[PDB]
Each structure stands twice: as C-alpha cells, then as structure tokens.
Ligand binder design. Structure first.
Ligand SMILES: Nc1ncnc2c1ncn2[C@@H]1O[C@H](COP(=O)(O)OP(=O)(O)OP(=O)(O)O)[C@@H](O)[C@H]1O
Ligand SMILES: [Ca+2]
Length: 859
C-alpha cells in the first residue's frame, strides 16, 4: 500500500542562489538577511552551534558516543516546531542523551523547502543513543511524548517507527571522510564504506540482522496507470509521466507530500496542489489551460492527474527555435511565429481573468507550444484570484516588478516582459531594466525593422492598459535616441574603467561582483570574483593607483596567508601575479616556497587546479630567471600525469563548471603543456598539449546548417562560452599554435570563429555569456577579417553595455544586478577588450607581467 508510493522516489528521470542576493534598492548583488531558545539547561550539557551550518548541538557531560550506529530523527510541522522541540529536548536532557536540532526558523525553512534535498528533508532533531538498547528504548519514549502532535514531513532516508513522527536510520554519528567521496562509515574489514544518504531507506550490509530485528517490533486508484518515468523531483513530491492502463492516455501525475516542500509563504506541497486543482476546475472550459483528469489520495501522498500536453515550454522553444545564428537575411519566420504565439497568449490571459483567476507566474517555463504552435499554460500552483493584492509565494525574477501589486496585474507585467523576451531572449531584472530596456528595444528595432518593433511596443502598451484596470501604474517615457552603441574599443575600456572607479566598495571585497564573492572560499579576494581581479585590471590601465595600493596594504596582504586554496582563479596564485606586478617581490618569493608543499594534489583545472597553478609558475619563471620555478613547474606536470593515470574523469566543484574546455577541462590543461614546451623545447610537452585538445574536440558537435562548432556536455547541451564551450577550446588551439609555429586544427578553429555570428546570449559575462565572444577577434590575425568579426561581437556586447551617467557599467549574471569582477562584470570585459587591441586571447589570465607573456612564449 505505502511501499508503492515510496518506491516512486526511486525512479530514474531525464542559480536559484541569485534570489538571496536581490537586496531591494541596490544595483549590486547583496545578501538578503533574515530562533529556538530553550531555557533551564543543566550544566552537564554543552550547547553550541555549527561553524557555518544549520544545527545546534546539545553535547552531554564528557561522554563519548560511537563514531557510527543507529540514530533517531524526529520530524515536525513548522507550526509545531517549538512545541515539539520542548517535549523532545526536555526528555533527552532528563536522560542525558546527546542530540541536535536545526538552529532557527530560517534553517527549518531551508531544509524543508520545495527544492531542499530529499534525503536531508524532514530531519528536524537528530538523537544519538549511546548503544542499541537505549536506541530501542528511546523509540518508544519519544513517540510516547510526541503522540498528540500533527504528522510532519516524512523523512525519505529513514524508516518510520509505527505511525509516529519518530524515524530511524543507521549511519555516521561523526563525519568520517575519505579521499574520494563525502561522509562515510566504518566496515568490519576495509573500513571505508560510504554513508548512503538517498531518498529511500537503506541498510549497511554488516548490521542487516539488527534491522531484521527492528522490523519485528516495528508494527488502488493509482494502480490504474503505468508510471513510466519521472520528469522531475523536488522535496514537495515527484512529477511523473504515466499511461492510463487499458486506454493508453498519456497523463501527468503531480505528487504532493503533506507537510513537505515549504515555500516563502510557508505553504506546503498539499496547499499548492489544492490551489492548482481549484484553478484548473475554474478553467475547465478555457481550452488553453491544461485539463485535470482526477484527484486522489494514495497512502499519505496526494496525486493530481492531468492532461499530458505534447510540445515544449517557451524556454525550450526559445533555445531550439530562436534564430541565434546570423545566416544573412532571415528573421521573418521568427517574426511570424512570435506574433502567432503572443496573440494567442494575450487571448488566453483574457480568458483566465474573465474566469476570475490569475495564473500567478506568467513566464516562459509555464507557457507551452505544440508542434503547430498552439499555446497552452501549465502549473497553476501560483494561481490567485484576480484583484487579490496578497504577497506572492514566489517571484520569477526577470518577469516581475515590485511596482505590481495586484495578481491580475502581475500576469500582464510578466506577459509584457515575455513579449519583448521572445524578440530578444535576454534576461533582465527590474533593477537593471531601467537601463537595458533601451539596449534591448534599440537592438530589436535595428535587427527586425520598424514594423516588428512597433508591433512589440503596441502590444506592450496594451499590457500597460490591462494593468491600469487593476491598479495605479504609469510607466516611464521612451525616447530610444538617448541610448547609443559604442564601437570604439578604447572608449569602451576607458568608460568601463571610470565605471569601476565610481563603484569601489570601501570594504574588503574592493568591488561588487558575482554572488560567489559570498558563496565561495576566497571569493572576496581572488581573481575570479574578488578584489584582485579589479585591482589587476585597474593596474593594467594605470588607474586608481592609490586606491589599489591601500586595498593591497590594508586588506589583501593580511588575507593572503589565510587563503587556503592555491588556485589561479579561486586561490593564491592569481593574487600573487597581481602582487608581483605591484612590486611585492619578497611576499611572492615567500609564498612560492610554501607552494610545493601544501596541496599539490588531484584538481588539474585552470580554474582551481595544478594546470592553472603551473601556468602561473611558468609565467613567474619567465619573469625571474630562477630555475627553482621551472623545477616546480616540472613537479606539477608529473603530478598532472599521475592524476591522469589514476583516472581520466574530472571533478567539478562549481555549479556552472563543465568538465570540458579551457576553464575546468582538458583544453585548459593543454595551456600549461604548451607553455612548458615554450620554456623547455621538450617535444613531449607539445605532444601532450595536442593530445589534450584532441580529447576535448571529441566532445564537440558541428551544426549542419550553420557551420558552427560547439562543445556538447553530459546533458546534450551545446556550449560556445569561454567556460565550458568551444571558444575556450579555440584559445588553447591558438596558444598551441603560438608556441609551436604551426596551424593545427585550422578546420575546427574556422568553425569556432563562426560563433561571431551569434545574435544574442542569455547573459553578458566573460565566462558564461557575451563577453566570451570578445575573445574571438583576438584569435584572428588577418586585419580585414578581424574587422568584420569585431563589429559583430560589438553588436553583441552592446546588448549588455550600460551607459550610466557619462561612463559605462556592466551587468552580472542574468543581468539581475551590476558586477565589476572578472567572472561576470566589467573587469573581465575590460581585459577581453584589451586582449583585442593587443591580439592577445590570453589577456584575461592573471599571469606575471602578462604584457610580455606572448612575446616570451612565441615559437
Ligand atoms: N501537463 C503537462 N504536460 C507536459 N509536460 C508537463 C506538464 N506539466 C508539467 N510538465 C513538465 O514536467 C516537468 C516537471 O514539471 P515541474 O512542475 O516539476 O517543473 P520543474 O522541474 O520545476 O521545471 P522548470 O524548471 O521548467 O519549472 C517540466 O519539464 C514541465 O514543463
Ligand atoms: Ca514548474
């Protein structure tokens, strides 16, 4: 009965962090800041919280507990949290039992949110019995204490004790780590077994018999369908593709787990599902709205069965159908398809509102298009009555405004933004829309022509009219002539520099940057997102010397020894390049002595691994003719060799890293080999360089219509970008050729350069967006061909480049906020543009005396 429901969680299947950084009324990424106090705590307990984590520990006396064993987890609903911890803790205290709980409301929310890990979900209190006897004792006593409480979210990783909120599992009591994996437990033999935390209960081999014991005293409306696959999982439940048996109707089954998957409004899976069901009933006769089949409870979960709509959501449609490639004259078909979709969508929103319901999240993900471009809307979990001025549970940044107050108005605003989006699929937030509205409309007009432009403006104006019926709303003026593109590279560099100069933080970060300034180690100080990137870039432009010197002297130097990673982009080495150029020779020489020691190990990437470090080391060897640095480079090479022999498969730490290309993949490793060749003349390093590129080229795909080569990842995604994409591959080919005097991979090179024909990218940044394309002209030696390529990518840059006062600034990832870092902001754009001037496709690398590096590594 219940085993069938739970098994659903086992089936196979096929950036949200930005929200936490939209502190209102800032133009930058800035954290939004947000309590289980218990009293009468005996002195036999020590009470502390985690370094950076969710748990408040209650450690008893001076006892030692086993390093693994049978542990108890307790679950509670949010409204019952304080009341459940009171009864549970004051039991454990009064029995001298070690336990922990989630430290505050925020933590509870984070761990039980819609997108929280399914394994970790529901675990509010963790209890650590000293041995198996007190374990089984506690099962009964805790459950006796909490019986008169509402059932909380089921913990998918545990077995439940009877019909209580008491759950149990065997795993690590402490965190026991290894060299290739996470949390582990000990065996009876080769004690290296991995602690399994999955969305289903599992038992370590060597304690099965005790689980067998535990099972002793431990006390179909859905069988109508063949549940084929799971389209998606969240903490709130699964969404499954099914076929109704003896009928063969494809349906969508949407699962809600009671008390699980909270949102910002503290609404659970069931609360949202009911809203979706109510909405779909009210819209039974609106043919554009997906139709509900049936609604039933099976075991404890609730199941909303739904028409399966054949086609693609507008995100997929955009990705696959938008005419990204400039093939010379031919965007008229797009114009046709966009009009047909949008005019359908206008009528659909009117129909929904006529029935008194706003859909609540009008944005590409929820709009589907059939093969003949019929428009349907799915996902009514966000539905509200039109006219309601309730705070929405969720906002899709990119298609919302805080200026919207009424639910009906929110739909029209999203549509309004959707209208321009299909014409230029480039994300923006309300915070930068003030600026980028000009960039986008100007682009649409120059590229589609006045007719289509006026279709867009008119339709957006009708949206305005629609909003005005719901609330007071009066949008700003137009006048597109106020915004002009720039095609003068020096001008763009100089104005972006003034931009940076005008946005210095007087804090430890030096500049505003990507959220990774906050989310990652060294992020405030390193080259990638930290102040070293900007300070380096400003130094190259002889700008802000006094400000740079002060940040170095008073922040960077005291932080340098304490940055634990040596990574080129993420850690010490990138910083040391800045330091050397700035004259701090003594400081650099000292850090180099430590460098052979600490963490010369498994990561080989340019970003954070041995290649990047080695590449820095080689650059330092070229600058100082100190042979110890060549020796060290050689040592790093052998260690890369060792790593490759242990296993070819690369590990990614960053959620946007892909194990191909120059940043995180083998193409990057080849840069180091190429450079090592330049300084040794050892042919063998040249061979390795070439072999590494070859291996990456195996993960590329040529389009048949367009001639463009891109990389293809492990989810069949095509990539152009410097990070993960073919432009980075091209750069390594270029450098291979630069150091050897050859012209290898001419064919691949030529088909990568064709990326300069790209009309738009969803984001603007050097690594993951438009800025990547600025690297293309820097790899073209012929002046005449360069000029055409440069103009094309400058058209692309001008979609992102913001005029603010009389200087330029640059949007960060997804253009939600501004950034001035190398990774996403103006610093990386500057370095790439300076690269174009200098014919240098490596100029974005923090190498020692980089203005000399090409000349010094030339064949
Ligand atoms: N009625 C339907 N017909 C066809 N596909 C559907 C239907 N309802 C949902 N889907 C698709 O099933 C998948 C999972 O739906 P779910 O609501 O869980 O979205 P999700 O995983 O959060 O994805 P997204 O990031 O697109 O919101 C999505 O690709 C969604 O578009
Ligand atoms: Ca959805």
């Amino acid at each position: 009965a219940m085993n069938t429901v739970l098994e659903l969680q086992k089936l196979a299947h096929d950036n949200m962090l930005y929200h936490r950084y939209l502190k209102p009324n800032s133009e930058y990424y800035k954290k939004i800041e947000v309590i289980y106090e218990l009293n009468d705590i005996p002195d036999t307990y020590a009470v502390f919280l985690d370094n950076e984590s969710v748990w408040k520990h209650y450690h008893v006396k001076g006892s030692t507990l086993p390093e693994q064993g049978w542990k108890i987890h307790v679950t509670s609903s949010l409204e019952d949290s304080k009341d459940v911890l009171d009864k549970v803790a004051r039991l454990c205290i009064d029995k001298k039992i070690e336990f922990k709980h989630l430290k505050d409301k925020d933590s509870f929310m984070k761990m039980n949110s819609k997108n929280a890990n399914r394994a970790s979900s529901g675990k509010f209190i963790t209890i650590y019995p000293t041995n198996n006897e007190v374990f089984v004792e506690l099962l009964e006593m805790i459950s006796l204490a909490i019986q008169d409480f509402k059932k909380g979210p089921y913990i998918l990783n545990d077995k439940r004790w009877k019909n209580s909120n008491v759950f149990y599992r065997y795993g690590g009591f402490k965190g026991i780590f290894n060299e290739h994996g996470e949390h582990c437990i000990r065996d009876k033999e080769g004690n290296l077994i991995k602690d399994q935390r999955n969305p289903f209960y599992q038992v370590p081999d060597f304690v099965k018999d005790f689980d067998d014991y535990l099972n002793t005293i431990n006390n179909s409306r859905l069988g109508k369908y063949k549940i084929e696959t799971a389209l998606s999982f969240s903490n709130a439940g699964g969404v499954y593709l099914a076929t109704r048996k003896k009928d063969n109707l494809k349906v969508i089954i949407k699962e809600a787990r009671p008390s699980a998957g909270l949102d910002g409004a503290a609404q659970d899976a069931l609360a949202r599902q009911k809203i979706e069901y109510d909405a779909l009933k009210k819209l039974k006769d609106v043919s554009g709205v997906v139709n509900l089949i049936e609604y039933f409870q099976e075991w404890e979960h609730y199941f909303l069965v739904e028409e399966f709509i054949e086609g693609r959501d507008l995100r997929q449609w955009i990705a696959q159908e938008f005419p990204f490639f400039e093939d010379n004259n031919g965007m008229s078909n797009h114009i046709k398809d966009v009009k047909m979709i949008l005019l359908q969508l206008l009528d659909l929103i009117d129909s929904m509102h006529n029935q008194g319901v706003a859909m609540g999240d009008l944005q590409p993900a929820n709009i589907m298009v059939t093969e003949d471009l019929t428009v349907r809307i799915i996902d009514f979990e966000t539905a509200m009555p039109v006219n309601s001025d309730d705070r929405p549970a969720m906002l899709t940044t990119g298609f919302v405004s805080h200026e919207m107050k009424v639910s009906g108005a929110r739909d029209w605003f999203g549509f309004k933004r959707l209208v321009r989006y299909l014409a230029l699929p480039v994300l923006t937030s309300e915070d930068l829309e003030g600026y980028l509205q000009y960039n986008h409309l100007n682009w649409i007009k120059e590229n589609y022509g006045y007719e289509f432009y006026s279709f867009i403006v008119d339709l957006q104006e009708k949206c305005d009219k629609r909003i005005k019926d719901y609330q007071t709303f009066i949008p700003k003026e137009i006048n597109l002539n106020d915004q002009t593109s720039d095609f003068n590279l020096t001008s763009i560099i100089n104005k972006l520099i003034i931009g940076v100069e005008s946005s210095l933080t007087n804090d430890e970060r030096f500049i505003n940057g990507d959220i990774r300034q906050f989310e990652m180690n060294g992020g405030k100080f390193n080259f990638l997102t930290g102040g070293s990137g900007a300070a380096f870039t400003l130094t190259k432009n002889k700008s802000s010397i006094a400000e740079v010197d002060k940040w170095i002297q008073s922040v960077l130097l005291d932080n340098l020894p304490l940055i634990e990673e040596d990574g080129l982009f993420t850690g010490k080495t990138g910083i040391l390049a800045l330091l050397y150029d700035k004259g701090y020779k003594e400081v650099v020489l000292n850090e180099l002595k430590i460098l052979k020691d600490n963490i010369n190990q498994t990561d080989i990437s340019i970003r954070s691994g041995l290649s990047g470090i080695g590449l820095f080391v080689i650059s330092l060897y070229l600058e100082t003719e100190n042979k110890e640095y060549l020796k060290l480079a050689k040592d790093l090479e052998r260690m890369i060799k060792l790593n490759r022999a242990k296993d070819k498969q690369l590990k990614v730490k960053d959620w946007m890293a892909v194990d191909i290309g120059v940043i995180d993949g083998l193409s990057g490793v080849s840069l180091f080999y190429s450079a090592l060749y330049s300084v040794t003349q050892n042919q063998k390093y040249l061979e390795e360089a070439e072999v590494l590129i070859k291996e990456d080229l195996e993960s590329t795909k040529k389009d048949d219509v367009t001639g463009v080569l891109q990389t293809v990842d492990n989810k069949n995604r095509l990539l152009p970008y410097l990070s993960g994409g073919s432009i980075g591959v091209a750069i390594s080919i270029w450098f291979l050729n630069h150091v050897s005097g050859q012209d290898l991979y001419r064919e691949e090179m030529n088909s990568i350069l064709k990326l300069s024909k790209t009309r738009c990218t969803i984001s603007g940044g050097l690594f993951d967006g438009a800025g990547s394309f600025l690297l293309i002209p820097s790899m073209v030696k012929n002046d005449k061909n360069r000029e055409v390529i440069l103009n094309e990518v400058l058209n692309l840059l001008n979609i992102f480049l913001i005029e603010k006062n009389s200087y330029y600034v640059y949007p960060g990832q997804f253009s939600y906020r501004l950034a001035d870092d190398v990774y996403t902001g103006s610093s990386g754009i500057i370095l790439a543009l300076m690269g174009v001037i200098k014919g240098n496709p490596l100029y974005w690398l923090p190498l020692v005396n980089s203005d000399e590096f090409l000349a010094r590594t030339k064949v």
